[PDB]
Curated annotation (Swiss-Prot), chains A, B, C, D, E:
Catalyzes the synthesis of phosphoribosylpyrophosphate (PRPP) that is essential for nucleotide synthesis. This is Ribose-phosphate pyrophosphokinase 1. Changing L128I: In PRPS1 superactivity; no effect on Km; resistant to inhibition by ADP and GDP. It is an enzyme of class 2 (transferase). Changing V218G: In a breast cancer sample; somatic mutation. Belongs to the ribose-phosphate pyrophosphokinase family. Homodimer. The active form is probably a hexamer composed of 3 homodimers.
Amino acid sequence: PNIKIFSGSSHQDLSQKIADRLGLELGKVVTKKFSNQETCVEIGESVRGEDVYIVQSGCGEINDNLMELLIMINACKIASASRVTAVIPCFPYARQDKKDKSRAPISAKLVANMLSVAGADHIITMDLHASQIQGFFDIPVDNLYAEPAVLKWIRENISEWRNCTIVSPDAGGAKRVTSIADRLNVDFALIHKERKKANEVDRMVLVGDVKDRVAILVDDMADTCGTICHAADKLLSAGATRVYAILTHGIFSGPAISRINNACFEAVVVTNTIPQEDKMKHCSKIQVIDISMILAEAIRRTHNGESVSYLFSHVP
Amino acid sequence: PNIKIFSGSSHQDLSQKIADRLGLELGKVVTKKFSNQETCVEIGESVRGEDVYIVQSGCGEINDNLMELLIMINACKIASASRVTAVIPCFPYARQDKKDKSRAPISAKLVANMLSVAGADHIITMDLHASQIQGFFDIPVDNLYAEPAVLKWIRENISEWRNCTIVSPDAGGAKRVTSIADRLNVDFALIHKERKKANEVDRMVLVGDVKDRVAILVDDMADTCGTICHAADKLLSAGATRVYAILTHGIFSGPAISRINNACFEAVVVTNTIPQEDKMKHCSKIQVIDISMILAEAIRRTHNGESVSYLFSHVP
Amino acid sequence: PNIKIFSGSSHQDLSQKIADRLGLELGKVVTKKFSNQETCVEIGESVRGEDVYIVQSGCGEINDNLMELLIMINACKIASASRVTAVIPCFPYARQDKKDKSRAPISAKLVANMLSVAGADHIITMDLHASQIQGFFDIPVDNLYAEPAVLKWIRENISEWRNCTIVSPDAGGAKRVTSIADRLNVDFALIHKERKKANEVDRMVLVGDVKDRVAILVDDMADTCGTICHAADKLLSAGATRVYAILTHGIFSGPAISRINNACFEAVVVTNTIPQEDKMKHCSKIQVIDISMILAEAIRRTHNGESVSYLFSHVP
Amino acid sequence: PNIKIFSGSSHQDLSQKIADRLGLELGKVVTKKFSNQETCVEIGESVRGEDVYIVQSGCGEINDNLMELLIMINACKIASASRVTAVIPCFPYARQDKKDKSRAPISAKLVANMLSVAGADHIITMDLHASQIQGFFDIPVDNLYAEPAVLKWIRENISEWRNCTIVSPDAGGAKRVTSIADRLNVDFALIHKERKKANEVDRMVLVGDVKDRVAILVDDMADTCGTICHAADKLLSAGATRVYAILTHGIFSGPAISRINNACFEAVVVTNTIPQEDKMKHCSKIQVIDISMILAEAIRRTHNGESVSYLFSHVP
Amino acid sequence: PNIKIFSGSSHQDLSQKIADRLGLELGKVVTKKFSNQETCVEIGESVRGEDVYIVQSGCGEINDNLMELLIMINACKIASASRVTAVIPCFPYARQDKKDKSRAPISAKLVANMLSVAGADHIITMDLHASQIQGFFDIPVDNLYAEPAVLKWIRENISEWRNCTIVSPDAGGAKRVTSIADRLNVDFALIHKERKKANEVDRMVLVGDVKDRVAILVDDMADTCGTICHAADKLLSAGATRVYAILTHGIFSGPAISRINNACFEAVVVTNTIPQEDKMKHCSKIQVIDISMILAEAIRRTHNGESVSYLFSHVP
Ligand SMILES: Nc1ncnc2c1ncn2[C@@H]1O[C@H](COP(=O)(O)OP(=O)(O)O)[C@@H](O)[C@H]1O
Ligand SMILES: Nc1ncnc2c1ncn2[C@@H]1O[C@H](COP(=O)(O)OP(=O)(O)O)[C@@H](O)[C@H]1O
Ligand SMILES: Nc1ncnc2c1ncn2[C@@H]1O[C@H](COP(=O)(O)OP(=O)(O)O)[C@@H](O)[C@H]1O
Ligand SMILES: Nc1ncnc2c1ncn2[C@@H]1O[C@H](COP(=O)(O)OP(=O)(O)O)[C@@H](O)[C@H]1O
Ligand SMILES: Nc1ncnc2c1ncn2[C@@H]1O[C@H](COP(=O)(O)OP(=O)(O)O)[C@@H](O)[C@H]1O
Ligand SMILES: Nc1ncnc2c1ncn2[C@@H]1O[C@H](COP(=O)(O)OP(=O)(O)O)[C@@H](O)[C@H]1O
Ligand SMILES: Nc1ncnc2c1ncn2[C@@H]1O[C@H](COP(=O)(O)OP(=O)(O)O)[C@@H](O)[C@H]1O
Ligand SMILES: Nc1ncnc2c1ncn2[C@@H]1O[C@H](COP(=O)(O)OP(=O)(O)O)[C@@H](O)[C@H]1O
Ligand SMILES: Nc1ncnc2c1ncn2[C@@H]1O[C@H](COP(=O)(O)OP(=O)(O)O)[C@@H](O)[C@H]1O
Ligand SMILES: Nc1ncnc2c1ncn2[C@@H]1O[C@H](COP(=O)(O)OP(=O)(O)O)[C@@H](O)[C@H]1O
Ligand SMILES: O=P(O)(O)OC[C@H]1O[C@H](O)[C@H](O)[C@@H]1O
Ligand SMILES: O=P(O)(O)OC[C@H]1O[C@H](O)[C@H](O)[C@@H]1O
Ligand SMILES: O=P(O)(O)OC[C@H]1O[C@H](O)[C@H](O)[C@@H]1O
Ligand SMILES: O=P(O)(O)OC[C@H]1O[C@H](O)[C@H](O)[C@@H]1O
Ligand SMILES: O=P(O)(O)OC[C@H]1O[C@H](O)[C@H](O)[C@@H]1O
Ligand SMILES: [Mg+2]
Ligand SMILES: [Mg+2]
Ligand SMILES: [Mg+2]
Ligand SMILES: [Mg+2]
Ligand SMILES: [Mg+2]
Ligand SMILES: [Mg+2]
Ligand SMILES: [Mg+2]
Ligand SMILES: [Mg+2]
Ligand SMILES: [Mg+2]
Ligand SMILES: [Mg+2]
């Protein structure tokens, strides 16, 4: 079997980068819409007995892209592909990973079941919002970390990183922030927005010392940037000299760009798990860490039957 | 269909309390071992068209108890029970909820699959180590909270609770601690044991102020009590006046009892999701919050087709 | 794909013998218990695209070992093994193969379903208590016979084997005894313990002539040795000169060792599907037929895509 | 839900007897063949929310009848029946219950899987050739015994039954014969046809004493009657005064009728799990035990959610 | 893996032709009936790791043949075949492809489910009665067309084919007839038998002009030939000079041979998806298009991982 890399409509630049790093051309696919807005998928080459990797991030037109991915997976399976792997850099519906409300769906589990029934044999993803999403499948799920790339960026772009403090913008980010602070041998802090019992002012509590130090906000994603912007205001109010925000998934939906442009961030750093070209044109603060080499190495090692553990300590 | 409550060998006192609160006698079951240590299950009454609830905590002889539960579920299903619900107050293998190591099993997902294939239609559990374990099943999973009972105990047993600080013993407990601190309108702190890069001394970092205040350690479980004991030493070293530990699952395996007896805890508070009678005989610091009323109300509402949302704000 | 042989905690000497006969080292696995007695499995090498064989007998801590086997199977499957085969020399819960009582579980079927959901693709076992257990799976199940090794032992160790009579200790062993008697061209007899209608003395009926002849008791297993010991008393009372007992699974649980030491057996012969080192130290009558060559040949032929029919007529 | 009894083409007289004992009319079904010999099933009434019981024995045109049963089960399921139960008095392919030959199918398991995928929720059958066939399903399987009816017939029709010996025609029938002999408090014997190593004369070995006593051959089925006829010749050669044959499934295929007419049987007794009207017209020795009351009681108790254990000790 | 071609009892001449075109001998299989008319399948060689193709048409003893095919598929799967493909030239129960009546089964879906549960990994068939039957499976289904062979026969055997009109015998054949007429650049007509509201005379309506032209009836199958015979009478009554009938599946059950012999057909042309040797002996009008080369090429390309699209434009 040979590696066949197919791109959905979501992140075709990332698919191209992965294919170039693998020394391959992208597989021939026409991914369009019928007139009635139904997804049209036209695989333009044989995938018989091939090791098919479909790159599709959960971003942009989320349901459009997920349906595109499912249809492409099913087409490859019925076309007798040896193995179909869904490379989903940003897993859609990952934040709907539990039922903590009455009648609430576990949409991440539904997406996992849909991918399984479409015929996916393997999932490659980066920085799942909850790592337990790996357990939502009965197939192997690669949950790659952007943490080595984040550490590289911090050590190369922040002069006073050895005296910095890594800040969690919410309680759920504590593990990620503590891991990064341990790897950098720096202090960490946590910011919590307390629960909205009524319609008074949202107030943020900070635990840890950030006074007269550079604060690096690290989180898994910035959708509306309410979390990171509120954390940034709190950090400046607490005496932080400079505030950075580093995310792996830059969704930047809704008012995020205006929020960041009016915030105090020295830089907002995201990976290219989601296309950022449009976002960077309206926000100069955004910088992008390319993770295409990580995904390409993961695909290559999956095809060659080699461990991907190397990707959790080094940036290829 | 009628409620049939069956007890495994793990926590029969809790099963009795649930049955009494439901105004029922426990179903007739003989749960023993064959000579070769294979689990022997002898259901002593018809469950045809009945709503069967099997109470079995993940504690004691873990694999023995889980096999007992699976065999009882399968026997009830083949005996044409209308519905089989596994009441698992402490979910076994819940800490193995992700693959963050090479070749690591997701044992929680395997346990969920085993329960599903045994024929469970419903799971009732308390304070899952990861709430995403709800997504490991395709059946409804009730993840009950001991938090209302914990808040009741704090308000009734700690005189200075309004000036206390709720402390997370690790980074993963941050959400639970922030929720409790919000409900009590008190400060919170977090304690992190940094990663063991080599064989030097384990050192703990505390973020937040606990000086001259009562510190309440809140966590989901205390297995060996290394986490809570190390956190307690750190809290006293940081100037805490008194230190409490409140858990929902008191496993207290291995050296936990000696650790607690030699620690500085004012009280170690656990629920009775795991039997504590033996533990209390060797550690006077342990106190037990009865959660049998919560489980009984959950079972009764499940049988009657009523919401269990009331259990997340009140202790019945 | 390459053969990877992994040992559970149950029978590691047999796993070592199989690996030596295959010219391989055992795969690196740490199979221990967490403090709370949950099974801990740490596969120490890649199994990507490998043909994994996990050796785990149903013996000793039965539920412990079965959970170990299931966790190891699931870990290998999620670790992208090409194929996972469970080598289970003595199938656990094999005697619970039917529902002939109200509410009785079919525990063998539950174990088969658990192995299937863990991800086993192939089962290799020896002398299933019921051969229909092969039908409990939807995957191929190799039910190897110890009969050629038993015939070899009889012809090499019993001088008057041509005038012996092979005796079934119960009605269920009749097929095995008739097959062995046909292969040896000798007489056979059957012993039946009639059903316990009340609390009077257990009485045994013998059909067939054993007077002044060597009697060989052949059965699939000896758990408590009540069956073989009662049959031995009956055979001596019926005029048998010498009495042998040949089993394939020597469980020897409970009072079996004292029963055998106080019985009249010339020799109790078992295979090493279950470890016998401890049993032989307390009972000199026990002798062991090594079947590691049969299992090793079965594994080798399974890997090479060759028939295992040769194993049913010859001992390699 | 109401009981709906539907008859296949196999045994419509038995279906009528069951319906009369249940005080019901048979459900309206047209079960014919299309011109190209495809099975045509036309259910003539609504089964929405009904408790559907389909009576179809494995006899006559075996594959025709099994396909008829599967199509009727699937039609009832798609027609929104509350529950579909397959009443299969003689389970087809039951003798293909294991893989003891290279490349041999387990046809009983395939039939079970086909019934499961057709949508059967419950199986009611009589005297499975192997009771482990219950484990071939994941649904409840009722394996009713004709033994109480057989004991009733023996006590009412054989004057010297207290001095009789119950004879197994092969090694596999030993459990059934020992159970019957225990219930009658009589002796038992076993007859074995040794394996055909070459083309010499088939010779039968008898263990047990039948001289000058009435011999009752008891087996689960008589297909070609080679087993019972050879056993009858052996029993007469051994000095039996009279020889009876009692089966639960009278298949009587091929040369069975001529074999019985030329045999020495006092009577050949079968149940009506298979239609016997044609067989009795050509063989006066055949007598029929009606088991329609057992099946009707089983269906009624299944519908009413009552235990069928009463059917294993009494004939209703 | 190597191609292994196994023949069922249905169409062994076609299997032989396929094997010869593949340069192979048919796999050793004994496909007979037990005495009680149960299907007996004895695969006479190893299929371990082999690419197994089982040829079995839906014809003759339909349920017999389908059960034979299912048993052979399951035997090959349990015998550890690498892949099992069911080559079903005429799909049985294909006309039962929808539920347009109360309580009607979808027998085609049931057959698909039975093939899936037997373990088929791939289906190769010719001219499905409904192409949507491909969607009844979750495995790849090759729906080969006899249309190129039909066009070849028309261009080589009908001198005035350029002035002919291709006639649909019913409304459902319109797509097939329009496709053929487009490929031949000829006119088309449609014949409809209006619905039987009462017991008056069946009357046929013809849309299109067939006067003084050769009419070619093209349909997917001729079971009883009522459709084609009635269409032929209508076509002659409408002024057609000569009438041909071309089918891909010649079932010719029941009165079809007498109907054709008394009809006005110049020739009745069928493929050999169903054996026609017996039919041709009683009807000189029947001619056979060999499609064994199409099936052999499909099998060869499936084994070699090559597209079968070439088969839809050319006859190999
Ligand atoms: N795509 C989404 N965008 C915004 N909010 C979401 C989205 N999906 C889910 N949510 C909401 O956010 C919740 C998850 O919140 P999160 O901050 O991820 O962690 P936690 O629920 O543990 O506090 C969900 O329960 C739901 O109410
Ligand atoms: N150091 C690590 N940190 C986090 N996750 C890891 C780590 N090592 C492995 N994993 C997880 O395990 C998966 C597979 O691990 P890997 O080492 O590539 O080999 P194997 O597939 O045999 O386990 C990765 O995709 C990742 O999800
Ligand atoms: N029963 C157990 N007892 C002790 N350690 C366990 C147990 N089950 C799993 N573990 C280990 O603990 C890890 C889980 O650690 P935990 O403190 O729950 O959270 P995190 O892994 O997110 O830091 C597992 O990956 C495994 O290495
Ligand atoms: N306030 C809450 N906090 C956390 N989990 C909740 C809450 N309300 C509901 N749940 C979860 O939802 C499950 C079922 O919710 P419930 O309100 O009883 O009704 P429904 O089953 O219709 O959703 C509970 O068992 C629990 O797991
Ligand atoms: N591990 C076990 N040890 C002892 N008895 C067992 C065990 N498992 C099941 N049993 C009991 O033994 C019965 C099986 O008996 P056995 O001698 O194997 O054959 P039979 O039931 O056909 O007479 C089961 O139905 C159950 O009552
Ligand atoms: N002579 C035999 N006696 C009993 N079982 C047998 C015999 N031959 C084969 N089997 C069964 O069939 C299985 C597989 O058979 P084998 O001859 O190795 O080839 P295949 O897998 O192609 O059938 C064996 O593992 C065993 O369970
Ligand atoms: N319908 C049938 N009619 C005749 N023989 C059959 C039938 N089905 C299977 N067989 C054969 O008989 C064998 C089963 O033999 P049986 O007497 O029931 O018990 P055992 O195989 O345990 O000696 C099968 O393995 C097969 O070879
Ligand atoms: N005495 C018995 N002998 C044999 N099989 C029995 C006996 N009692 C029950 N069974 C089996 O168990 C099945 C169901 O048992 P039953 O007593 O009716 O209640 P339940 O379904 O709750 O187990 C029966 O259909 C039969 O297969
Ligand atoms: N093997 C068969 N032989 C004859 N008629 C059949 C067969 N299978 C199904 N039928 C009947 O024919 C119907 C299908 O008719 P057909 O001419 O194929 O198309 P349509 O139903 O779309 O008009 C089925 O609904 C059923 O009533
Ligand atoms: N021109 C066509 N007309 C009709 N069906 C087609 C055509 N091309 C392909 N198919 C269908 O697609 C199946 C597989 O197509 P093929 O071109 O062989 O490659 P792939 O399997 O990769 O799709 C065929 O078996 C057939 O059912
Ligand atoms: O749009 P925002 O909610 O600010 O950003 C997404 C956040 O929501 C979730 O907690 C994620 O972990 C992030 O912290
Ligand atoms: O025995 P210990 O590890 O101290 O207690 C169990 C802890 O391990 C996990 O993090 C749980 O969340 C607890 O904090
Ligand atoms: O401990 P024991 O019951 O004596 O030995 C196990 C027996 O139980 C079952 O019948 C097995 O076939 C053996 O004959
Ligand atoms: O036609 P026959 O083989 O004589 O009768 C069927 C027999 O085959 C099987 O062993 C059944 O248990 C019966 O004893
Ligand atoms: O026996 P006949 O019904 O005439 O031939 C079979 C027909 O029935 C279905 O419509 C097929 O498409 C054919 O047109
Ligand atoms: Mg979250
Ligand atoms: Mg967050
Ligand atoms: Mg954890
Ligand atoms: Mg923790
Ligand atoms: Mg048994
Ligand atoms: Mg026995
Ligand atoms: Mg048998
Ligand atoms: Mg028999
Ligand atoms: Mg149609
Ligand atoms: Mg038609």
